[PDB]
Amino acid sequence: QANTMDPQLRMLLEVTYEAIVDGGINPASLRGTSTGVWVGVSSSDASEALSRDPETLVGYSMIGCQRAMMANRLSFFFDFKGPSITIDTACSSSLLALQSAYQAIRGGECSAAVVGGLNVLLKPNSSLQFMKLGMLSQDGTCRSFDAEGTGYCRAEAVVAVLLTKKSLARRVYATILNAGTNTDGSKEQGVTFPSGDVQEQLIRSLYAPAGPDPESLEYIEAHGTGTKVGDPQELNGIVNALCATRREPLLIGSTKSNMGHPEPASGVAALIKVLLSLE
Amino acid sequence: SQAWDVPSAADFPSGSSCSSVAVYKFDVSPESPDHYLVDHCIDGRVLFPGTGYLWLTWKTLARALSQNLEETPVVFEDVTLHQATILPKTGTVSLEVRLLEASHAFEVSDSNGSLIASGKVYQWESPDPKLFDTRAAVDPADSTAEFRLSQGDVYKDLRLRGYDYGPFFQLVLESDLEGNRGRLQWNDSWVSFLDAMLHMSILAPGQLGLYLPTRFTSIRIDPVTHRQKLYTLQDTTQAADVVVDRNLNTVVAGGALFLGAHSSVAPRRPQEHLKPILEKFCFTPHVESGCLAGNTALQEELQLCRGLAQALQLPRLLAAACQLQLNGNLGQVLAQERPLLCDDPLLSGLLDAPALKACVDTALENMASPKMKVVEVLAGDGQLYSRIPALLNTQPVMDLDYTATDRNPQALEAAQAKLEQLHVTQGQWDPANPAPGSLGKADLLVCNCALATLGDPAVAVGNMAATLKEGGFLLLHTLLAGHPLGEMVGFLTSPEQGGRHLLSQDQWESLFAGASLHLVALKRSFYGSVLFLCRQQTPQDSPVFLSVEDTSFRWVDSLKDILADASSRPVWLMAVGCSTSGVVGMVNCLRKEPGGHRIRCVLVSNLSSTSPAPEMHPSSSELQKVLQGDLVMNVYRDGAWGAFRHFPLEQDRPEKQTEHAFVNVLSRGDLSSIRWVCSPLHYALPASCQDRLCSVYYTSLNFRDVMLATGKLSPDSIPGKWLTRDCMLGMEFSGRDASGRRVMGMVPAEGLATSVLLLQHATWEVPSTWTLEEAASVPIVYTTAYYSLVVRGRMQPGESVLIHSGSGGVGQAAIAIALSRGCRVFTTVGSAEKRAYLQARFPQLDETCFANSRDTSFEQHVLRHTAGKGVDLVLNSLAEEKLQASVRCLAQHGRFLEIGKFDLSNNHALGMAVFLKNVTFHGILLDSLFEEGGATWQEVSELLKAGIQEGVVQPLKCTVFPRTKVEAAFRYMAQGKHIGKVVIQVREEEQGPAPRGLPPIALTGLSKTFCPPHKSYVITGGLGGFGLQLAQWLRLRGAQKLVLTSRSGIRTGYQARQVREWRRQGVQVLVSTSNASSLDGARSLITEATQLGPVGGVFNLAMVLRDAVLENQTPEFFQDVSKPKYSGTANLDRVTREACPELDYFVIFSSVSCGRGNAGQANYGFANSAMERICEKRRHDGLPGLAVQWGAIGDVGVVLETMGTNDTVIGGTLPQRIASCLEVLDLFLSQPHPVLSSFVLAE
Amino acid sequence: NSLAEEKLQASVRCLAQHGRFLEIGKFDLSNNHALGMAVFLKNVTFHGILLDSLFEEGGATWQEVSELLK
Amino acid sequence: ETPVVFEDVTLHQATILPKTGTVSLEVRLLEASHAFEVSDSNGSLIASGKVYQWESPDPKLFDTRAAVD
Ligand SMILES: NC(=O)c1ccc[n+]([C@@H]2O[C@H](COP(=O)([O-])OP(=O)(O)OC[C@H]3O[C@@H](n4cnc5c(N)ncnc54)[C@H](OP(=O)(O)O)[C@@H]3O)[C@@H](O)[C@H]2O)c1
Ligand SMILES: NC(=O)c1ccc[n+]([C@@H]2O[C@H](COP(=O)([O-])OP(=O)(O)OC[C@H]3O[C@@H](n4cnc5c(N)ncnc54)[C@H](OP(=O)(O)O)[C@@H]3O)[C@@H](O)[C@H]2O)c1
């Protein structure tokens, strides 16, 4: 039943144990909580793989590949009786999972969360599509910001962080001040087009009048894909929302230039770059 | 630790929808569903089942059809398997099956792209169940009588041949004796059932050798009728009836019907991780003097170092450290003995020949348990650590603690590379007494003293004496100064003023008498090297003395009583009467049977071999000489005290002085494996055939001789009924017949020979004007030509002919003959130089006559100067595309003469539409005439007889080799570097003035036992597993008169058939119930065999077992076991002498149970050791005598019928696959020695 | 043989050693159907046959065939 | 870039293209046997032979010389 397990789910089961114990907790001390699990997953390539040979391929592959099982089977093992959920929003996902989670703790529902980001590259077709849309860099790099940006360079990652109410955390990497998501309306220039005029808005909803001070920001970690369109549209809207303020306001960077674009894992894989560098 | 399944790049859709292709990935490891496959073990590999590919392909077809396997009754046609697939112990192999849905064709690729199997498949629309009838020849009222073959019986005959089928594949339950009927067991696996049908096909009576499938013509499976045709045994299992109709070539079983399922030969590949350990069992004295003196190498050195060094009184030390000191001509003198100081294990300095093993041995059975702690002081220079781990690892019952201790850490440095694999405990040690904890007391201590001599005599020995363990052993080796070299070692490497520090024999004698020792052994060399074994004795107790001379076996309940005696330290067994009292074997059993383990079970034996050898008395002087020595094993032959030891055999393939020999290959495809085998005429020339003898001056190779000595062509496509697919080379020769006449002739094979048996319908008188050379080139060549052109292609004069390869043998002749009746010739030829030879040799050739031969260009060329009409006959001997192109040169009414065999052999396609040119296509095989010499052959002979007298036929260019370079004669012919014939010469011809010579041919010929067809051979227990094989093997090596003995008679089907068949092959076989343990019985037997013909062979294979440890043994469990072996052997010895004046072979199977012993076979042991005496008597009397101590015997022994596999580890050994036994026995038979061992090593 | 496909092939298999196939038929011939060359190890000889190839080409061979009739 | 060799090619029926509409020819390859086949929509056999990449493309085979002016 393990050779029919999507390698994501395999190493998710590990990284989230590695994460729960990372912060001084014994996973067992959670057994039976109102604790939830939120997984950002875009591609479950492994599932199709073990679903083509109709004499060869077995029935319990789906208990090890169906997307929901990415969260469900993580709840199943740790005995986490609160929400179990996988979200697909594409490149964002894991970050909107880590949002969806934060809210659920904040609001009483839970006392702790497993937030996961998953994305493993198996089927070459996938990539081929992405190239036929020209969002892939022949270069094969994520030149962030730089003018030498064609497209991004897809990378994989299984990553997990454990959220908790402070009155229960033995370790604190950082504290979540705010989060929210919106969605580019109907842009006249296609669905792939990143609408900065709408990303600005999102960044506002969370700061000045209904959030922290745009002046407190030391570092904003961009998306920083490396699109000849994406990069400007984003960075523009960024300054157009965080910058009536002196000193070199926000130093900026993007893990994605170090490692590639983990797509739905990006957000959380990004957060990890951030927490790491803080420590 | 454990790694898991990562969906793979190619696992995802990479083309599109395709109902017509399937990749199957087979995993064979013990977990997989497809583990069953590991039971298809052929010759020891796990081949994926011929049958298997059809099962895939079938599966693959129902895929494309959306239907399952049980609804798609299939039809195969013209299926052809090309290579089989070897499944690796672990990992995954992939077979891909592709379907052509309109052409009905199909193909099976592998991962690597190779072709595996091709044919045509399709749904079978009108499945006619009447095609699967099971109706007999009549009503058999023969249940309860009959004689069938039992599942066991069947796979016995197969596994014999090379088919190591495993359980999940042993599906043949029962079989008719001829293998035309029977019952196959259902498995719910087509791959098995299908391959079982193949079994039955392969399972002919008297068909030997290893056969894989290769073509089917038409398989037809209909799973509906199949479910029906099936039944259920009482077993609760499932089976159906199989039937084979060899006259129609069809196997049917349940719902699967084969047609034309042609299988074919495969080469057995000798896995040399199963080469047998061959040992000779000579008697060895403890008192050996003047040893060696048989090495031409060691005597060319007591004079090359007593000749440059005798002026002061090449390769190795005393030659290199003594010569490089006269080259510079004491300080740098110890600097020219050290670039060659490890050049010190020198042949002379070191005595590693037989002596070393003879004493290590003595020491080794003198401990209860076959485990031995060994230690070696002065280990660096005197490297005994190289030899004794090897001498010991030789025995099947061993456990070794080797410990190499040296004064410095330095000297054990070059040994880190060497000691790590022999597994040797190391440490530090200087012969000054102190025996560390790092020694903890041993069993044997060894020491090379032709070394940096210890410095001290009895101080070095006071340590070696303080590491004994009760009464262990000491082996030491000093160079003695009572010789020309003994004092010449002392002077050299140790510059010391007392460098002459190496005492003499008497001086070492009392250096041991001091530590309380006893010289157990002594090996005095001729050059001065001497070997000392030493054992130091802890007091003896109450020495019980039991004589074992009786025939009763009373002593049995007396040794069963001496197992009540507590620590009876000395319990000595001793024959005094019978010189055939196999105690030596007995002992070896008890000496490690729990009860007498530490019993110090000793033996004493009287084996005088000639009459004037009296000298054996107890109670007196010698009894105590031997009790003092204490040695476990004490034998006495005509003067010397020494045990019976095992030594390695002299290896060299026994040759013989002959006037007859034929050359054979020893390994299909490796030309180095060519030698001169003994001709069977060297064994007997019976008046009958004798008036046909012929001595060969020249034998000539032909192409077939090569393609076989290579292996491009299977001994399959050779016409004729063949006793032995073995000997098969040479068919042309020239010499003088028994008349004295002067002849050239052909011969179906075995032509490469000093002598040959004249085929009278195919031998001609060679004219006065032809040398014997020139004559020896003609026969094949021309006949093949005349047969092709004239008889078969009915060539008429003034036609056009395309002869390929004009340079060739057949070529030159072809041309000569076409040119004689004046045809337009067109020849092909590879060399620019061959264009030359030909243009010369035949003047009537234009430049228009020549085209190439390494290429298809010849077609275009023939089509030009033929005005697009083509040639009237083609003599094609070329391959694939070139043959096809040769077909296209055919003009209307033309005739293709296919001399070639490759394209033919592989069932290549021929474009039928060529037959509209009213063309006729001639397959041609001269070997199909010849022996079978009919009318047609005569017609072809007188075409030669005539063409000769009309000068049409002329000798070719002869590139002649000496009878030594037979090998190169082949490789030279290999690489097409020849014009005309290649001829191997055997006798320089007899010159000018008419000589009537009479040749003195001495020749170097390897021995191969053959049976004169007039002598009769006797094997007792001839119906027993092995005997049946010995009989088989006998008939093969020639025997015509067998006498097989058994107490009951023919009782198994598997016997019933072997004997029934041998009778059909013309062998005179006689099953006898005469028992040889009674003298009257023996004479009855020999007289029986004599009515068949003088007796030439006597093999004693009979044996009854009585397994039981010594406390279960009764004095008649003992007498029963020896009656067939000792009593039988003895009687047959007597009777044989009294009246068998033509006996050549007297053979007797012993066992290693007599050698190293087996717990619970104390009786078996005795009986067997007994025979080894009687055989030694005979050898000593100059009579044939051979006892073989076999190890575990596989393929058919008492083993395969009792226990189980050829994988069973018995007595620390493995089953010798009978095949190997026979070829070992073959070696043994032509040996001097009386006793020889043979067993395989376990782990 | 004057028969077709599978029947021709099956007719080939009735050949004994040294046997001779007389192919009078024309269908299998005409479509360049495959012939299993391995049949020629039986030292068999295969005869394509067209009487129309002599008929007006009235040569020696035709005469031979006529006096077999005569 | 794939200079090819056909062998023993054989066309069985030809295909009639209708004034309008679409016809389908399917080509199947046997990569080890070098064989090939051409089916049609209806399953029928259209053309069969052997094809393969031509390793040593000998341009001298395309000689348009001739010494008859
Ligand atoms: N059916 C029968 O009864 C029968 C009887 C005799 C012989 N045969 C067959 O007829 C053939 C000719 O026999 P033979 O003894 O007359 O000829 P041969 O002198 O023994 O040599 C065979 C010829 O093949 C040509 N050849 C092409 N490539 C070659 C290569 N790579 N290695 C060796 N030779 C090569 C050589 O001529 P080029 O170099 O000029 O091409 C050579 O002259 C043989 O293949 C044999 O099997 C059949
Ligand atoms: N197999 C091994 O592993 C192995 C190892 C070492 C040595 N050997 C040698 O193998 C020989 C036989 O063993 P095997 O397994 O090959 O065959 P086997 O079948 O066990 O041979 C024994 C047969 O000999 C016959 N026999 C017994 N006493 C006889 C007598 N007094 N007179 C005439 N025939 C008698 C019996 O035939 P009936 O059916 O009439 O009773 C019996 O079936 C022995 O001599 C032994 O030295 C075998």
Ligand SMILES: NC(=O)c1ccc[n+]([C@@H]2O[C@H](COP(=O)([O-])OP(=O)(O)OC[C@H]3O[C@@H](n4cnc5c(N)ncnc54)[C@H](OP(=O)(O)O)[C@@H]3O)[C@@H](O)[C@H]2O)c1
């Ligand atoms: N190549 C030459 O030079 C040459 C010359 C003359 C004739 N031929 C050939 O020889 C063959 C016989 O010619 P023929 O003049 O003797 O003709 P025929 O015998 O008078 O009639 C043809 C025979 O073919 C058999 N046949 C098998 N299946 C048949 C079917 N489905 N329908 C009709 N008949 C069938 C019939 O015998 P059954 O009812 O017993 O099956 C019939 O007797 C012909 O096929 C022709 O091509 C060749």
